[PDB]
Amino acid sequence: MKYMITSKGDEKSDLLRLNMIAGFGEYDMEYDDVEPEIVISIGGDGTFLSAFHQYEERLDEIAFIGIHTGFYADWRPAEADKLVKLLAKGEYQKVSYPLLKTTVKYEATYLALNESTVKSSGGPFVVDVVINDIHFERFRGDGLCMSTPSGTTAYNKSLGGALMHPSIEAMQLTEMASINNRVYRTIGSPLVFPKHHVVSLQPVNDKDFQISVDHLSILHRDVQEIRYEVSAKKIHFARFRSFPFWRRVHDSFIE
Amino acid sequence: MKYMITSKGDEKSDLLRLNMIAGFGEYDMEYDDVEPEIVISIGGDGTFLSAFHQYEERLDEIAFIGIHTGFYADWRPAEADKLVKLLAKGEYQKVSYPLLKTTVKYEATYLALNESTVKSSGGPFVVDVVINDIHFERFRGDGLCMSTPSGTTAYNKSLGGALMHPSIEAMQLTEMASINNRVYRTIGSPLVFPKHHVVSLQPVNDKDFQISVDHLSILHRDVQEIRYEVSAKKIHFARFRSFPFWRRVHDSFIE
Amino acid sequence: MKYMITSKGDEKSDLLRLNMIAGFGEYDMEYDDVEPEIVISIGGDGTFLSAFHQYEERLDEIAFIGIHTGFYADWRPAEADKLVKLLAKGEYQKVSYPLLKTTVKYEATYLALNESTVKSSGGPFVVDVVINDIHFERFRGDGLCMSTPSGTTAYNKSLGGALMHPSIEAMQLTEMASINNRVYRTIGSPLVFPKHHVVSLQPVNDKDFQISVDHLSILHRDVQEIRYEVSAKKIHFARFRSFPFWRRVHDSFIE
Amino acid sequence: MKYMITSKGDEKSDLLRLNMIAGFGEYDMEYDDVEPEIVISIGGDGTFLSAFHQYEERLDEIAFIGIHTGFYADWRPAEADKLVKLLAKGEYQKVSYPLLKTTVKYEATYLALNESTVKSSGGPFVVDVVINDIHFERFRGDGLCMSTPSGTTAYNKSLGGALMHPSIEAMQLTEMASINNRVYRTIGSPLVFPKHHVVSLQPVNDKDFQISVDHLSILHRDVQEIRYEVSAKKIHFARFRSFPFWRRVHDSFIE
Ligand SMILES: Nc1ncnc2c1ncn2[C@@H]1O[C@H](COP(=O)(O)OP(=O)(O)OC[C@H]2O[C@@H](n3cnc4c(N)ncnc43)[C@H](O)[C@@H]2O)[C@@H](O)[C@H]1O
Ligand SMILES: Nc1ncnc2c1ncn2[C@@H]1O[C@H](COP(=O)(O)OP(=O)(O)OC[C@H]2O[C@@H](n3cnc4c(N)ncnc43)[C@H](O)[C@@H]2O)[C@@H](O)[C@H]1O
Ligand SMILES: Nc1ncnc2c1ncn2[C@@H]1O[C@H](COP(=O)(O)OP(=O)(O)OC[C@H]2O[C@@H](n3cnc4c(N)ncnc43)[C@H](O)[C@@H]2O)[C@@H](O)[C@H]1O
Ligand SMILES: Nc1ncnc2c1ncn2[C@@H]1O[C@H](COP(=O)(O)OP(=O)(O)OC[C@H]2O[C@@H](n3cnc4c(N)ncnc43)[C@H](O)[C@@H]2O)[C@@H](O)[C@H]1O
């Protein structure tokens, strides 16, 4: 199979990458970073996010694996040799996670694996929240976060969001510091949306917004609409062993 | 069709019930509170919850309707005559919401439409939380709440839980006042579970618990396990017009 | 000086108590549990709370010390011999913390070192909150917690309350699961009150309440009013070394 | 007395200002915007904040009044004529609120009436929190907010902070979206500090920060320290009638 490996680019990670490549040499099994079927990320979750965004045009063709030197890792660096063999022998089943589609109209389209957020350029942030064409609330505050299920353990979590099992095809919207008084009113609760529901943000003033997709953060000017929906596209993971999401959550947050 | 009507038992509600019955007399269309196909609740959400729990053995056979004199209402009292006609002419499609199965072992089984909660008899509350047989956390605090999607606007909401669209077959667990220090540790985030996931609570001490299912609240003694899962059974609603969940949420919480 | 020692009543604690007594025998320095000037608590914070409530009629005359076998401890069990000597030689300055006065009218009066809470007998909990005779809010939910500054790290903390330095003569009110919708409305924010401010809770229905003061929890019947204020009385601590509150908070919650 | 009036600069406010000036003409009572003893703000709380920051070198000499066309207002526009007379006849007592001193070292010093916040230039935000020279926590997240007591109803409130009566000489620190896992740990609770306590923020990386003081927001480069403390300076308000803080809180947030 075609494969490539990204590295966090530090010493531990580069050396681990070279050893896996060498191990892969003993199978066939060729390195190709243009059209891989297997993408291996060595480093952290940021490294993994970058790997995802590198090959986002090829998501249907790729199975991703992460090594942590991690919610998208998965393998310790000492398990690397076992990973080469198992991966060479094709001894793996695939799991798929949902992604979030962001549409920015003035049309630009983005995929997130963790989340997309909106803040103002600075700037009070005021937007109208429209769910399935129905006007839901006028949001005043610092911003909004829209999360995939695997993204729920990330920024969403820090915002008081729920953690969702990634087999649920949904997206979750959280508030950042909303103003609520006798005048101004938001739901003040995370909102979880099914597939096919469309959350639309529309400017009240003030059409400039700092929009983030996972790590990428760009100021968009003269925005008419930001549109959120569960993507029809999914990321596919290779594995290999049972490592349940709730165990992964336990390992990262409890002990 | 067979039908019955429950009333909040105040003047407005009893009189509205008698008028609908009289209106129903002009169709056929017979009153039967043993095996109705249509159950009409007049009053509040508590009235509706009682109606549900009255006919919980017959959920596959019944379409419920609520009039509010409401998340399970739905119809204003002035719309009652239009409801009789529409209901008589069979001019309705059915919508289904998920329910939560609670199992209490010492085995007792309960269905909730809103939620089931666990507290101690008083009593520090300490339980071990086991997800799909994996030990997740030892919870110390006031108690736990497990919510259906339509229950998310209720007790769940007051506990910092997310609001979930009821087309998502899931249940959501929230904490009540958890102790967290350098010793004791909980996830401190709502958890959203798919169908087939099983959340199990097991006593650490101390096997007496005040367990609630919607409005019903009973002290269970010598408990070995409380077990939560998305029920295979669903409640069915009759309607009639578009009244979207997110609109319903807006109407109840925003304006 | 007159002194006494309470023990958690387990093996470690009883034995540590007997050794301190023996060490105290070498000074003068007599044991008296009727009118001590020094009260030593060995065990946990619960042991310390009990010690406080044992001698609450004598707070102006007593300096308390805690050994943890702890926010009210303070000394490790290995430091006990150094504590005997230092305490014998009178090598200590006193620090005072504020307390909360609870008044229950039908009049009963209680002092809390941590907090006093109000819930219903079960029972929806609904009370009118009156600050300095002004009607502030109608509270609907599970209950309310009123905390001293040293109590802020306890139950208050689990309820989303702020941690306050105990040199501030104040009390803090937190909500337990308040209902908020378009109908029902609470402040949904902890409230911090100065000395001389009076928070009054008054029944709406329904005059039975489960009222807690620190560990003690009793059902009060036919309540007309619960009244909260910063007590004129203060607890006095003996010490001995610098152990700053914020360090104590760090040690208990961070690392 | 010397006096001046600032206006929100819209029609209602400018016209109300001219009428008060004319009313003041009938007393003596001269307009002076260089050294006023009375500063009247007409508009909103932003107008009032600007008025405060205009005359921050003269706080000991000035009594501020706000008209709202408001937590710092206070007077409705229809009450303006009564305000002129009462203010002319000197029929007022003064109330003082605490302020927050911010020190930025590379030394720049700022006063806030609401709050000062710190975020990164963008930029992960990581700082070490040092209370009275003791290292308390390493904060990772979006930023931190330090609030005066009258500022607690503002940005602090939206961040889950407590509302404090402004007679309490204190400052309150809240978190913006902190990361907490098994690795990274913050207190995750607002912290309330007495007068003379010093909260120090120190860079970990990364010495550029967006620092806000009330409305003003500037990027500071090559920061070594941000230092917070209750200011020795206080704002003085003129009034006139009883309008208690808790009533003001009720009027703005409940009904
Ligand atoms: N799915 C998931 N679950 C749990 N933990 C995760 C996850 N993904 C990344 N992370 C962790 O987030 C932590 C901080 O993010 P980091 O600095 O790694 O960001 P990246 O460039 O990779 O990439 C930026 C990411 O950080 C997230 N982020 C950005 N700001 C915050 C704050 N303030 N709190 C929490 N998360 C944030 C942002 O959404 C992106 O997800 C880091 O320790 C990662 O291990
Ligand atoms: N699905 C849904 N969405 C939004 N609002 C709803 C819903 N169901 C009931 N309610 C409302 O809850 C409010 C309080 O409940 P109520 O006293 O009606 O309780 P019931 O006997 O019907 O029945 C007891 C119910 O109240 C819930 N409950 C109990 N205690 C609380 C607190 N403290 N906060 C919020 N909800 C609570 C409990 O779970 C049961 O759901 C009331 O105004 C209802 O209109
Ligand atoms: N001042 C202070 N700061 C930090 N930690 C403290 C403090 N005082 C006690 N504790 C700790 O609270 C923990 C639980 O309380 P525990 O069971 O010790 O209660 P006690 O009988 O002593 O006594 C009952 C106490 O527990 C508090 N309590 C009761 N329920 C809760 C919940 N659900 N969360 C947090 N605290 C609670 C209650 O207010 C009383 O303060 C325990 O680990 C203590 O070390
Ligand atoms: N003391 C107090 N209590 C209650 N409400 C108040 C107070 N002061 C201002 N406000 C209100 O804050 C609201 C938003 O602030 P606005 O846009 O007025 O800001 P300003 O330029 O005056 O000035 C900027 C101010 O807004 C605050 N602010 C900035 N962002 C937020 C968010 N996201 N939530 C809440 N407050 C914020 C910031 O700290 C400054 O205090 C506005 O409706 C004011 O009436």
CA triple B188-B138-B201, angle to 5 deg: 100
Of A141, A181, A254, the CB nearest to D253: A181
Three-class DSSP category at C28:
coil
Three-class DSSP category at A90:
coil
Q: D201: how many CB neighbours lie within 10 A of its CB?
A: 21
Phi–psi pair at B83, nearest 5 degrees = -65, -45
Ligand 1 centroid distance, CA of A209 (Å): 21
Rounded-to-integer distance, Cα D100 and Cα D183, Å: 32
Catalytic site residue from D33, D45, D133, D214: D45
Specify whether C45 is catalytic.
Answer: yes
Query: A9 to chain D, minimum CA–CA distance in Å?
Result: 19
Rounded-to-integer distance, Cα A204 and Cα C112, Å: 50
Three-class DSSP category at D23:
helix
Could you say which residues from 207 to 226 on chain A have a Cβ atom under 8 Å away from some Cβ of chain D?
A: 217
Q: Which amino acid is located at C176 in the chain?
A: M
Ligand 3 centroid distance, CA of C155 (Å): 6
Q: Measure Cα distances from D244 to C125, D75, D241, D250 in Å.
A: 27, 13, 9, 10
Q: What is the CATH number of the domain that holds A66?
A: 3.40.50.10330
Both B88 and B169 in one domain: the answer is: no
CA triple D223-D228-D229, angle to 5 deg: 150
Rounded-to-integer distance, Cα D81 and Cα D52, Å: 23
Residue D22 in contact with ligand 1 by CB distance below 6 A: no
D177: left (phi over 0), alpha (psi -120 to 50) or beta: left
Query: A236 to chain B, minimum CA–CA distance in Å?
Result: 19
Cβ–Cβ contact C178 with B under 8 A: yes
Phi–psi pair at C20, nearest 5 degrees = -65, -45
Tokens of C161: 């309350």
Both C173 and C253 in one domain: the answer is: no
C137 Cβ contact list (under 8 Å, min separation 6):
C128, C129, C185, C186, C187, D250, D254
* Resolution of the experimental model, in Å, one decimal: 2.2
Residue ranges at the known binding site of A: 45-46, 114-115, 140, 142, 150, 153-158, 215
Q: Which amino acid is located at C70 in the chain?
A: G
First to last CA, chain B: 37
Query: A183 to chain D, minimum CA–CA distance in Å?
Result: 8
Is D46 marked within a binding site? yes
The per-residue DSSP string of chain B comes to -EEEEEE-SSHHHHHHHHHHHHHHHTSS-EE-SSS-SEEEEEE-HHHHHHHHHHTGGGTTT-EEEEEE---S--B-GGGHHHHHHHHHTT--EEEEEEEEEEEEE--EEEEESSEEEEEESSS-EEEEEEETTEEEEEEEESEEEEE-SGGGGTHHHHTTPPEE-TTS-EEEEEEES---SSS-----S-EEEETT--EEEEESS---EEEEETTEEEEE-S--EEEEEEEEEEEEEEESS---HHHHHHHHHT-
Rounded-to-integer distance, Cα C203 and Cα B239, Å: 40
Ligand 3 atom showing the smallest separation from residue C48 Cα: 22
How large is the C-alpha radius of gyration of chain D? 20
Query: D168 to chain C, minimum CA–CA distance in Å?
Result: 6
Please, what's the b/e burial string for D49-65 (b: 16 or more CB within 10 A of its CB; e: otherwise)? bbbbbbbbeebeebbbb
Our measurement of the distance from residue D36's CA atom to the centroid of its chain's CA atoms, rounded to an integer in Å, reads 20
Q: Give the residue from A151, A138, A130, A190 showing the smallest Cα distance to A71.
A: A151
E strands present in A121-253 = 125-131, 134-141, 143-147, 163-164, 170-176, 191-194, 199-203, 209-213, 216-220, 225-239
Of A190, A194, A247, the CB nearest to B134: A247
Structure solved using which method? Answer: X-ray
DSSP 8-state symbol, C162: P
How large is the C-alpha radius of gyration of chain A? 20
Both A191 and A225 in one domain: the answer is: yes
Q: Which amino acid is located at D110 in the chain?
A: Y
B209 Cβ contact list (under 8 Å, min separation 6):
B118, B119, B120, B121, B125, B203, B219, B220, B223, B226
Tokens of B157: 């909401």
Both C87 and C125 in one domain: the answer is: no
Quote the number of domains for chain A.
2
- H/E run at residue C231: strand C225-239
DSSP 8-state symbol, A161: P
Phi–psi pair at C118, nearest 5 degrees = -130, 130
Tokens of B207: 């096997």
Could you tell me if D87 and D20 are in contact, meaning their C-beta atoms sit under 8 angstroms apart?
no
Rounded-to-integer distance, Cα D139 and Cα A83, Å: 36
Please, what's the b/e burial string for D173-183 (b: 16 or more CB within 10 A of its CB; e: otherwise)? bbbbbbbbeee
Both A122 and A210 in one domain: the answer is: yes
Both B81 and B173 in one domain: the answer is: no
Both B51 and B104 in one domain: the answer is: no
Both A13 and A36 in one domain: the answer is: yes
The per-residue DSSP string of C34-52 comes to SS-SEEEEEE-HHHHHHHH
Q: Measure Cα distances from D25 to A173, C32, D31 in Å.
A: 56, 77, 9
Cβ–Cβ contact C177 with B under 8 A: yes
Rounded-to-integer distance, Cα A56 and Cα A235, Å: 9
Q: Which amino acid is located at A201 in the chain?
A: L
Kindly give the pairing relationship between strand C108-112 and strand C93-105: antiparallel
Could you tell me if C237 and C65 are in contact, meaning their C-beta atoms sit under 8 angstroms apart?
yes
The per-residue DSSP string of D80-149 comes to HHHHHHHHHTT--EEEEEEEEEEEEE--EEEEESSEEEEEESSS-EEEEEEETTEEEEEEEESEEEEE-S
Of A192, A247, A253, the CB nearest to B168: A192
Cβ–Cβ contact D177 with A under 8 A: yes
Q: Give the residue from B142, B146, B144 showing the smallest Cα distance to B116.
A: B146
Rounded-to-integer distance, Cα A91 and Cα A239, Å: 8
Rounded-to-integer distance, Cα C57 and Cα C62, Å: 10
Phi–psi pair at D156, nearest 5 degrees = -40, -45
Rounded-to-integer distance, Cα A24 and Cα A46, Å: 25
Kindly report the length of chain A: 255
Domain extent at residue A109? 99-232
Q: Give the residue from C134, C248, C247, C164 showing the smallest Cα distance to D169.
A: C164
Could you tell me if C90 and C182 are in contact, meaning their C-beta atoms sit under 8 angstroms apart?
no
C24 Cβ contact list (under 8 Å, min separation 6):
C3, C31, C84, C88
Both D34 and D131 in one domain: the answer is: no
Rounded-to-integer distance, Cα C2 and Cα C17, Å: 15
Both D110 and D226 in one domain: the answer is: yes
D133: left (phi over 0), alpha (psi -120 to 50) or beta: left
Q: Give the residue from A83, A116, A98 showing the smallest Cα distance to A195.
A: A98
The verdict on a CB contact (< 8 Å) between B162 and A189 is yes
First to last CA, chain C: 37
Q: At what angle do helices B11-25 and B80-88 cross, to 10 degrees?
A: 30
Q: Give the residue from B52, B87, B45, B49 showing the smallest Cα distance to B69.
A: B45
**How many interchain CB pairs under 8 A, A with B?**
95
The verdict on a CB contact (< 8 Å) between B192 and A168 is yes
The verdict on a CB contact (< 8 Å) between A254 and D182 is yes
Residues in chain C preceding a C-to-N separation beyond 2.5 angstroms (breaks): 69, 106
- Residue labelled with tokens 């109300």: D16
Cβ–Cβ contact A196 with B under 8 A: no
DSSP 8-state symbol, C56: G
Cβ–Cβ contact C198 with D under 8 A: no
What's the longest Cα–Cα distance across chain A?
Answer: 70
Please, what's the b/e burial string for C156-183 (b: 16 or more CB within 10 A of its CB; e: otherwise)? bbbbbbbbbbbbbbbbbbbbbbbbbeee
Ligand 3 atom showing the smallest separation from residue C47 Cα: 22
Residues in chain D with CB shorter than 8 Å from the CB of A159 are 177
Cβ–Cβ contact C137 with D under 8 A: yes
Both D201 and D104 in one domain: the answer is: yes
- Residue labelled with tokens 């937190």: C174
Could you tell me if D142 and D118 are in contact, meaning their C-beta atoms sit under 8 angstroms apart?
no
Alpha helices in C169-231 (DSSP H): none
Is D165 marked within a binding site? no
Q: What is the CATH number of the domain that holds A109?
A: 2.60.200.30
**Strand partners of residue B218:** B211
Rounded-to-integer distance, Cα D235 and Cα D227, Å: 21
- Ligand nearest to the Cα of B152, by number: 2
The per-residue DSSP string of A201-233 comes to EEESS---EEEEETTEEEEE-S--EEEEEEEEE
Residues in chain C with CB shorter than 8 Å from the CB of D168 are 168, 170, 192, 194
Rounded-to-integer distance, Cα B99 and Cα B147, Å: 9
Q: Measure Cα distances from B67 to B13, B16, B73, B238, C226 in Å.
A: 9, 10, 5, 12, 38
Residues in chain A preceding a C-to-N separation beyond 2.5 angstroms (breaks): 69, 106
Cβ–Cβ contact B194 with A under 8 A: yes
Which residue has the CA at smallest separation from atom 37 of ligand 2?
B155
Rounded-to-integer distance, Cα C170 and Cα C196, Å: 9
Rounded-to-integer distance, Cα D67 and Cα D63, Å: 14
Both A54 and A148 in one domain: the answer is: no
E strands present in C121-180 = 125-131, 134-141, 143-147, 163-164, 170-176
**Strand partners of residue C234:** C98
Tokens of A44: 């952290």
